[PDB]
Design a protein around this motif. Structure first.
Motif, short mmCIF file in Angstrom:
data_model
loop_
_atom_site.label_atom_id
_atom_site.label_comp_id
_atom_site.label_asym_id
_atom_site.label_seq_id
_atom_site.Cartn_x
_atom_site.Cartn_y
_atom_site.Cartn_z
N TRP B 270 0.79 -1.19 0.01
CA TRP B 270 0.09 0.18 0.05
C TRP B 270 0.74 1.30 -0.05
CZ3 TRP B 270 0.94 2.46 4.59
CH2 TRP B 270 1.43 1.57 5.79
N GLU B 271 0.29 2.11 -0.33
CA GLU B 271 1.06 3.53 -0.68
C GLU B 271 0.62 4.75 0.09
OE1 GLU B 271 1.76 4.89 -4.72
OE2 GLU B 271 3.16 3.18 -5.02
N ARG B 272 1.40 5.23 0.68
CA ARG B 272 1.11 6.66 1.85
C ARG B 272 1.89 7.95 1.16
NH1 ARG B 272 2.20 6.25 8.08
NH2 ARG B 272 -0.25 6.02 7.72
N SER B 310 -4.04 18.94 11.43
CA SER B 310 -2.43 19.14 11.64
C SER B 310 -1.60 18.48 10.82
CB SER B 310 -2.37 18.66 13.17
OG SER B 310 -0.87 18.45 13.30
N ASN B 311 -1.84 16.97 10.78
CA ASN B 311 -0.69 16.40 9.79
C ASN B 311 -1.43 15.25 9.30
OD1 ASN B 311 1.42 15.11 8.75
ND2 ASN B 311 2.46 14.77 10.79
N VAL B 312 -1.97 15.21 7.93
CA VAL B 312 -2.79 14.27 7.07
C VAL B 312 -2.03 13.32 6.07
CG1 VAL B 312 -4.46 14.42 5.28
CG2 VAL B 312 -4.77 15.77 7.20
N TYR B 313 -2.09 12.22 6.38
CA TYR B 313 -1.68 11.16 5.56
C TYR B 313 -2.67 10.25 4.86
CZ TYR B 313 2.98 12.07 7.30
OH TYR B 313 4.24 12.64 7.64
N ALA B 314 -2.52 9.85 3.57
CA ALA B 314 -3.45 9.27 2.82
C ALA B 314 -2.78 7.76 2.49
CB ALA B 314 -3.92 10.04 1.55
N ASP B 315 -3.51 6.84 2.73
CA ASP B 315 -2.93 5.38 2.44
C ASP B 315 -3.86 4.94 1.47
OD1 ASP B 315 -1.25 6.15 4.62
OD2 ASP B 315 -2.23 4.82 5.84
N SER B 316 -3.35 4.23 0.30
CA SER B 316 -4.15 4.06 -1.00
C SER B 316 -3.91 2.46 -1.15
CB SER B 316 -4.23 4.75 -2.12
OG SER B 316 -2.77 5.01 -2.45
N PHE B 317 -5.00 1.70 -1.47
CA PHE B 317 -4.73 0.29 -1.92
C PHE B 317 -6.12 -0.47 -2.48
CE2 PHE B 317 -7.05 -1.39 1.75
CZ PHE B 317 -6.64 -0.43 2.71
N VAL B 318 -6.24 -1.45 -2.73
CA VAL B 318 -7.07 -2.22 -3.50
C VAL B 318 -7.39 -3.48 -2.97
CG1 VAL B 318 -8.14 -3.21 -5.54
CG2 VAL B 318 -6.96 -1.12 -5.82
N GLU B 382 2.28 -1.00 9.60
CA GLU B 382 3.62 -1.42 8.98
C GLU B 382 3.33 -2.14 7.70
OE1 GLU B 382 5.76 -4.23 11.51
OE2 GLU B 382 6.71 -2.55 12.58
N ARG B 383 4.33 -2.43 6.59
CA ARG B 383 4.22 -2.99 5.58
C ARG B 383 5.25 -4.10 5.41
NH1 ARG B 383 6.15 1.39 3.37
NH2 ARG B 383 4.09 2.03 2.83
N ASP B 384 5.01 -5.17 4.49
CA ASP B 384 6.05 -5.99 4.32
C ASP B 384 5.88 -6.82 3.07
OD1 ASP B 384 6.34 -9.55 5.13
OD2 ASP B 384 8.05 -8.23 4.76
N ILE B 385 6.99 -6.03 2.07
CA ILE B 385 6.93 -6.39 0.70
C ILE B 385 7.85 -7.30 0.43
CG2 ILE B 385 5.90 -4.11 0.11
CD1 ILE B 385 8.52 -3.09 -0.67
N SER B 386 8.47 -8.06 1.25
CA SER B 386 9.29 -9.27 0.80
C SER B 386 8.65 -10.22 0.05
CB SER B 386 10.30 -9.46 2.25
OG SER B 386 9.27 -10.32 3.07
N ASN B 387 9.45 -11.08 -0.56
CA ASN B 387 8.74 -12.25 -1.18
C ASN B 387 9.84 -13.30 -1.13
OD1 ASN B 387 7.31 -14.24 -2.59
ND2 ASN B 387 7.29 -13.07 -4.54
#
Ligand SMILES: C=CC1=C(C)/C(=C/c2[nH]c(/C=C3N=C(/C=C4/NC(=O)C(C)=C4C=C)C(C)=C\3CCC(=O)O)c(CCC(=O)O)c2C)NC1=O
Ligand SMILES: *[C@@H]1O[C@H](CO)[C@@H](O[C@@H]2O[C@H](CO)[C@@H](O)[C@H](O)[C@H]2NC(C)=O)[C@H](O)[C@H]1NC(C)=O
Ligand SMILES: *[C@@H]1O[C@H](CO)[C@@H](O[C@@H]2O[C@H](CO)[C@@H](O)[C@H](O)[C@H]2NC(C)=O)[C@H](O)[C@H]1NC(C)=O
Ligand SMILES: CCCCC/C=C/C/C=C\CCCCCCCC(=O)O
Ligand SMILES: *[C@@H]1O[C@H](CO)[C@@H](O)[C@H](O)[C@H]1NC(C)=O
Ligand SMILES: *[C@@H]1O[C@H](CO)[C@@H](O)[C@H](O)[C@H]1NC(C)=O
Ligand SMILES: *[C@@H]1O[C@H](CO)[C@@H](O)[C@H](O)[C@H]1NC(C)=O
Ligand SMILES: *[C@@H]1O[C@H](CO)[C@@H](O)[C@H](O)[C@H]1NC(C)=O
Ligand SMILES: *[C@@H]1O[C@H](CO)[C@@H](O)[C@H](O)[C@H]1NC(C)=O
Ligand SMILES: *[C@@H]1O[C@H](CO)[C@@H](O)[C@H](O)[C@H]1NC(C)=O
Ligand SMILES: *[C@@H]1O[C@H](CO)[C@@H](O)[C@H](O)[C@H]1NC(C)=O
Ligand SMILES: *[C@@H]1O[C@H](CO)[C@@H](O)[C@H](O)[C@H]1NC(C)=O
Ligand SMILES: *[C@@H]1O[C@H](CO)[C@@H](O)[C@H](O)[C@H]1NC(C)=O
Ligand SMILES: *[C@@H]1O[C@H](CO)[C@@H](O)[C@H](O)[C@H]1NC(C)=O
Ligand SMILES: *[C@@H]1O[C@H](CO)[C@@H](O)[C@H](O)[C@H]1NC(C)=O
Ligand SMILES: *[C@@H]1O[C@H](CO)[C@@H](O)[C@H](O)[C@H]1NC(C)=O
Ligand SMILES: *[C@@H]1O[C@H](CO)[C@@H](O)[C@H](O)[C@H]1NC(C)=O
Lengths: 295, 658, 98, 49, 49, 49, 98, 30, 87
Positions: B270-272, B310-318, B382-387
């Motif tokens: 996912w992307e932030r 104050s501090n806005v973050y957007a996380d996007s995925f499908v 947290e994210r884990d993009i290992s394969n």
């Protein structure tokens, strides 16, 4: 009810003379020097020397009674405590009798003791020479009158020297007025706690009411505001219960002071260790912040 | 052309029958002794509701028209009484210039409400109040005989109508046929205390704002006060004005970049993205984009305006169709354990929409993957993009082994499948509030700053009441707000001027009311404990002087001294002396006397007297007891079962009373 | 008994008649806590007042023995002046010394 | 009431007025010589004839 | 029937004695005091009856 | 200490073990409030005695 | 919730809704249902606004062809062959008192 | 090799201005 | 390492979705670097009027600081006091 009880306490202790007596111009009654327990006319203050010494010792928490809005609106850079107390709704009221009236009452009591003796308290003011009054009091404690009359002069010297010793010992020693000062401190401490308990959120989301009302709907803000209201109500209830318990002890002490004034200043007591150590002769009252001092 | 109203406009607030009680309520009432405007036709505004009175003898005032715009482009209601009947009608009338009595309307169309009643000097009075799409009408009648004005009196009003109309009522206009007069007054939100007699009607009522005596009456909850001095509420200054401050932000937020992007990442990758320096005007999305899921945690959606973040973050995925319910705090599943995790104390908003046309193609769209095998669960954010190939024991392997698999699994999206197997695009927005300088902010309109009096302030969403003063504190660059020992918000930074402001409340100082008793008279004196009146007083007085206790208003300062009747303080006492009035003096210590001292004379009594004196002492008080169950629960069984779990309170209480 | 204490009604029958079980047990406990705290406050006030009544009764008992059963020489303990004697009289919840 | 307890109700059929009062009233006290002593007790009902 | 009872447990977890709260004024006293042994005197009881 | 004060248990470990933060910090608050009230009552009685 | 239908915060009642595609949607397109998407503020609870006048963001009265002058009502397009999120639903809201 | 910290590693807890204040917090400290 | 007292200020926080379980320093090719581990504990702080955080005390090193945390002040009068548990 607590405040009314405080005014009644002061009135029952001090206002025990039916009429006020003017202080004599001559403070020297047959060798006994009364200069340090009677008011000085030319001096600007109407208290005694010993009363001035007693008023200097108790570092009284200055209660204002004139703290205007601009005085608290200014001086923000020093975070004063009384400004915060008055901003959060806590008020201290002035007493009914000012310090000058109490000093006048004690001056009338000492002037009555020096001239009328023991008769004005239990009747009318009946004047008598001071040496004959001291002879009567020696007769009261079991010693004949000739013991006073043979050696009156060294008795008067001992009296004057003991008064000088008391006056000297009230200029250096600090702990002597420990029961009065503590009272002042205790009150201030309790009241200050009533401000800091405004910083507790009581299990709500925030301690500030504005943030809760600003980021929530109606029904969700009702619960948080109710939790804050319950917490602050029970904090205020705790404060009032502690004050009600402390006032009973103050009233018991004031009752003891009233009966000591009635039985030792206006008369001679035969109760053992009720007024000093030894055989009692007489006593003199002096005023003090929120209290009395018996000699 | 203007008069006063006294004890006019009291009505029944509820349908509860109660008697021999003094009920206290808070709602829209007409204040006592308030201004009314007389007419002997304009377009009178409404603003909260109207008290409307009509002194007449020949029935010339009949009906009203209510509406926002008096054109035919809006919706309006007429309440008219023709010669034989009462008709209420809410429609789109084209209101003529002179609504003369019939034929008030030229034409009527597109309309919703109609009510028709049964076939049908002195004073008629009404109260009209509009709230929650309901128009409440109260009516009272009085046979008076005076003609220049409204007679002073107390008359209650009964409810007749509540009409279900969804109408903007900002203007109204009376309807006249062709002497009599009609008067208009404005309701306000106030607190009243009523009295109910034996039959159950209201006979008397008192305001809680016109007088210090009224404030005392509402505080003690009585209509009869004994002689004394009483502490009332502290001195209040009402706010007059408004200041609203917000940063210099002009451009709008990238809604098209975030929502209408060309492609979204996978849920395991996912992307932030950080959002800053924009105005969150989401109402522009009311034309193209529509969301199947939109849920906010921490705040209210209605409060998404009026607020500044104050501090806005957007996380996007499908994700797929039935995994969207896993994007929430406290969830389990394949997405929540190994792909994307939300914190328990999450403040933000989750929003998701269905994209079957752009993400699902025929013969499959196997470009979106998710992880279903892992050694342990994910931490929040947290994210884990290992394969790497996965083995249950915990040892490295090769994918043609028997206990060795690939941890990622492909989503399969087709155009013809149910909603539970369709693509969904998910955006999670995270922010905090009231913690830091704010860069992304809500759409509002600012106001110039006032630095002298008590105003309502709105600093970056921080709403309050107080006075604004110039300060001299030294804020660090990362600090926006300051708090006190009691966590009041004492200081703030202006988002435009960047100066430091200090905030303090505008109510300060105690007030006491001295009264000789309501039985004796109805006059009072007011003591302001900490002002110097040689101001911060309210309305008026005739005598004003400065005691040692404070400022006294309403008393005469005599010179002679008596004994104390009502103790004020600091040596000042007061009483009620002769036309009687309240006088203040310095209390007398005692009778003045003197006795001469001489060293060779003595006074001896020559007679005596016998005197008997009485002394009263309390000995006992009343013995009382309580049934804990009957007081708390009454007759309810369920309450008693719930009360059994509060063990050892009632026993500990009965023991003390015994 | 007419306060809500944060609940939806002060009448327990309304809460028990219009709400679900678990939601009613949440609204009921606020009323239970409020009424317990009210009754606790009342008992604390009574306990404080009983001490003042007891001290007054102790003084009235010691004034009966030293002034009715004897002649006291303590100044102003029994009236103003030189005490000759004293008589008791009953009164509602109290005593009156002549 | 003053305590917000419902007392009066209008019966929806006969349109009469009815008053609800609690079915529990009065204080009951139990006098015992001791459970170590006999098991008989005396009962005092406060303020009733 | 739905009624109110009071029980007792030993040092081995075994129940040994129990009393109903709606048969006697003495039993109502036992349930109000929450004990099995009652001293001599007069007590005020609840309304489990 | 054995009163749950209308929470799900009088044991803190059970509340912490089968619930999460937002829901389990509501029951713990009720337990904390009840226990503080009991301690306050004890101290008030001692101050009077 | 902003420009068409608003519920109060202290709402007592029931909201119910059911899917009607066979009676409200046609393959050609049912364009008989409209909704307001442009307004100069937010509605209050249980209010109505039935008015079709041209809308301009600045706030002045306008003429329907212009630079920034729009019609405030959009049309629901209800086709039969579309997903569940674009199908018609009938909604009934019941308001009570107790 | 081995040494001693001796009152090191204290950082700002929040982003709130506080003056003439005493303040107690639990956190990951050295 | 000097034994003095100094406060640290925030500079930046980074939005990284990473397990950090190991770290390593990067050095050019005399000077020294010291590493210590953080633990979850309770501290009591004291601010300056116009300045920064000036005083800070632990509650677990010695019984005296435990007393300071129980009374919540830096100046203690002579006597005997009952302390809480912070060890
Ligand atoms: C204007 C709107 C209007 C309203 C809301 C209205 C309501 C109304 N008027 C009533 C009485 C009455 N209605 C009229 C006639 C009138 N001719 C007029 O132009 C006016 C203003 C009145 C008075 C409302 C008269 C004469 C009475 C009897 C009053 C009396 O003599 O006691 C009653 C019955 C009294 C009751 O139910 O308690 C109602 C409900 N009548 C109206 O006309
Ligand atoms: C009810 O209708 C009136 C009449 O239009 C609305 O008043 C307008 O409100 C908007 C929004 O604040 C202003 O921009 C207009 O200038 C107002 N009209 C006039 C003539 O000044 C009112 O806002 C409506 N009420 C609600 C709740 O929408
Ligand atoms: C971050 O990485 C570490 C190290 O790879 C992970 O720790 C492993 O956890 C599994 C779970 O059983 C163990 O089998 C491994 O032995 C651990 N590795 C080591 C080196 O001890 C850790 O799980 C990762 N973070 C998260 C949140 O999963
Ligand atoms: C049926 C045998 C087990 C019965 C007892 C169950 C105990 C554990 C409780 C719930 C687990 C049931 C399966 C939950 C699956 C979650 C799937 C998801 O959310 O993605
Ligand atoms: C009495 O004492 C005062 C102060 O001690 C002294 O000034 C005064 O002279 C004395 N009076 C005499 C010695 O007569
Ligand atoms: C009524 O109008 C007069 C005229 O200006 C004004 O002086 C008075 O204050 C008004 N009444 C009120 C209650 O404001
Ligand atoms: C009333 O509305 C019609 C359209 O329905 C319009 O033509 C007419 O001009 C309107 N009336 C007035 C007075 O403008
Ligand atoms: C009054 O209006 C009603 C409703 O339109 C009508 O039935 C009645 O005849 C009217 N009466 C008169 C006198 O016009
Ligand atoms: C209002 O009337 C116009 C024509 O007069 C019509 O086109 C429109 O549909 C009507 N609207 C309503 C809500 O009745
Ligand atoms: C109202 O109460 C009085 C009591 O004085 C009574 O006489 C009268 O009949 C009552 N009114 C009605 C309508 O019953
Ligand atoms: C809304 O969308 C339609 C579709 O083309 C467009 O014509 C209209 O201009 C849009 N509204 C605004 C305010 O841009
Ligand atoms: C913001 O706007 C105000 C408007 O007067 C201006 O003075 C200021 O320089 C602008 N910029 C900042 C950073 O405040
Ligand atoms: C009040 O103001 C007057 C103005 O001359 C001043 O003399 C007086 O001292 C002030 N009051 C106090 C308590 O300072
Ligand atoms: C004492 O006074 C009384 C009056 O009360 C008088 O009758 C009596 O004669 C007086 N005694 C003497 C000895 O004068
Ligand atoms: C039913 O209710 C009506 C009131 O409308 C009443 O008159 C009637 O007596 C009741 N009972 C029967 C059996 O109809
Ligand atoms: C019952 O007792 C009360 C008071 O003791 C008395 O007033 C009443 O008349 C008695 N009843 C009968 C029927 O005697
Ligand atoms: C205020 O800060 C300055 C440094 O900007 C410093 O020199 C001064 O001593 C400080 N004042 C106080 C009272 O600490």
């Amino acid at each position: 009810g607590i405040a009314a009880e405080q005014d009644r306490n002061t009135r029952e202790v001090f206002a025990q003379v039916k009429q006020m007596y003017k202080t004599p111009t001559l403070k020297y009654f047959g060798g006994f020097n009364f200069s340090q327990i009677l008011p000085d006319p030319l001096k600007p203050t109407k208290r005694s020397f010993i009363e001035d010494l007693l008023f200097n010792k108790v570092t009284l928490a200055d209660a204002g009674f004139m703290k205007q809005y601009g005085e608290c609106l200014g001086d923000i850079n020093a975070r004063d405590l009384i400004c915060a107390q008055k901003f959060n709704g806590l008020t201290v009221l002035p007493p009914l009798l000012t310090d000058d009236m109490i000093a006048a009452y004690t001056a009338a009591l000492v002037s009555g003791t020096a001239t009328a003796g023991w008769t004005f308290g239990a009747g009318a003011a009946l004047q008598i020479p001071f040496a004959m009054q001291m002879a009567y009091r020696f007769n009261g404690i079991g010693v004949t009158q000739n013991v006073l009359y043979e050696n009156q002069k060294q008795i008067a010297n001992q009296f004057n020297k003991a008064i000088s010793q008391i006056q000297e010992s009230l200029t250096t020693t600090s702990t002597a007025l420990g029961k009065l000062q503590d009272v002042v401190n205790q009150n201030a401490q309790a009241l200050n706690t009533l401000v800091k308990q405004l910083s507790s959120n009581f299990g709500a989301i925030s301690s500030v009411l504005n943030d809760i009302l600003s980021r929530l709907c109606k029904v969700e803000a009702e619960v948080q505001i109710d939790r804050l209201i319950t917490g602050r109500l029970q904090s205020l209830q705790t404060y009032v219960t502690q004050q009600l318990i402390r006032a009973a002890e103050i009233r018991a002490s004031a009752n003891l002071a009233a009966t000591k004034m009635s039985e030792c200043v206006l008369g001679q007591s035969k109760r053992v260790d009720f007024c000093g150590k030894g055989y009692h002769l007489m006593s003199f009252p002096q005023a003090a912040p929120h209290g009395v001092v018996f000699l | 052309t203007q008069h006063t109203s006294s004890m006019r406009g009291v009505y029944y607030p509820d349908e509860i029958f109660r008697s021999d009680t003094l009920y206290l309520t808070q709602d829209l009432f007409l204040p006592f002794y308030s201004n009314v405007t007389g007419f002997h036709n304009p377009v009178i505004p409404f603003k909260d509701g109207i008290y409307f009175a009509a002194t007449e003898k020949s029935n010339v005032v009949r009906g009203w028209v209510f509406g926002s715009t008096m054109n035919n482009k809006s919706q309006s209601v007429i309440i008219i009484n023709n010669s034989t009947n009462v008709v209420i009608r809410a429609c789109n009338f084209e209101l003529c210039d002179n609504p003369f009595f019939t034929m008030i309307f030229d034409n009527a169309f597109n309309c919703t409400f109609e009510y028709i009643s049964d076939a049908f000097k002195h004073l008629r009075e009404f109260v009209f109040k509009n709230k929650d799409g309901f128009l409440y009408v109260y009516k009272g009648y009085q046979p008076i005989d005076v003609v220049r004005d409204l007679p002073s009196g107390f008359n209650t009003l009964k409810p007749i109508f509540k009409l279900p109309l969804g109408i903007n009522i900002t203007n109204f206009r009376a309807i006249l046929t062709a002497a009599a007069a009609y008067f208009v007054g404005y309701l306000k939100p106030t607190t009243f205390m009523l009295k109910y007699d034996e039959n159950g009607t209201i006979t008397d009522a008192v305001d809680c704002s016109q007088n210090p005596l009224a404030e005392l009456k509402c505080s003690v909850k009585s209509f009869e006060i004994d002689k004394g001095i009483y502490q009332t509420s502290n001195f209040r200054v009402v706010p007059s004005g408004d200041v609203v401050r917000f940063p210099n932000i002009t451009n709008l937020c990238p809604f098209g970049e975030v929502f209408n992007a060309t492609k979204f990442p996978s849920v395991y990758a996912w992307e932030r993205k950080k959002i800053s320096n924009c105005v969150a005007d989401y109402s522009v999305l009311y034309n193209s984009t529509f969301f199947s899921t939109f849920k906010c945690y921490g705040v209210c959606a209605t409060k998404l305006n009026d607020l500044c973040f104050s501090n806005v973050y957007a996380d996007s995925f499908v994700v797929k169709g039935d995994d969207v319910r896993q994007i929430a705090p406290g969830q389990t599943g394949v997405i929540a354990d190994y792909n994307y995790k939300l914190p328990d104390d999450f403040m933000g908003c989750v929003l998701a929409w269905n994209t079957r046309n752009i993400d699902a193609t025929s013969t499959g769209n196997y470009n979106y993957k998710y992880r279903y095998l892992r050694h342990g669960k994910l931490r929040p954010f947290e994210r884990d993009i290992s394969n790497v190939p996965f083995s249950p024991d915990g040892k490295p392997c090769t994918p043609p082994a028997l206990n060795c698999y690939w941890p990622l699994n492909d989503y399969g999206f087709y155009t013809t499948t149910g909603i539970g197997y369709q693509p969904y695009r998910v955006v999670v927005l995270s922010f905090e509030l009231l913690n830091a300088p704010a860069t992304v902010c809500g759409p509002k309109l600012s106001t110039d700053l006032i630095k002298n009096q008590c105003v309502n302030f709105n600093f970056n969403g921080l709403t309050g009441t107080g006075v604004l003063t110039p300060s001299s504190k030294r804020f660090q660059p990362f600090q926006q707000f300051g708090r006190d020992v009691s966590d009041f918000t004492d200081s703030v930074r202006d988002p435009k001027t960047s100066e430091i402001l200090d905030i303090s409340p505008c109510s300060f100082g105690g007030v006491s009311v001295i009264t000789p008793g309501t039985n004796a008279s109805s006059e009072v004196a007011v003591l302001y404990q900490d002002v110097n009146c040689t101001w911060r007083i309210y309305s008026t007085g005739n005598n004003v002087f400065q005691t040692q206790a404070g400022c006294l208003i309403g008393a005469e300062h005599v010179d002679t001294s008596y004994e104390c009747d009502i103790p004020i303080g600091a040596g000042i006492c007061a009483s009620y002396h002769t036309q009687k009035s309240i006088v203040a003096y310095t209390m007398s210590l005692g009778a003045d006397s003197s006795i001469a001292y001489s060293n060779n004379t003595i006074a001896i009594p020559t007679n005596f007297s016998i005197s008997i004196t009485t002394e009263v002492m309390p000995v006992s008080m009343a013995k009382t007891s309580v049934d804990c169950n009957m007081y708390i629960c009454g007759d309810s069984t369920e309450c008693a079962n719930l009360l059994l779990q509060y063990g050892s309170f009632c026993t500990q209480l009965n023991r003390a009373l015994s």
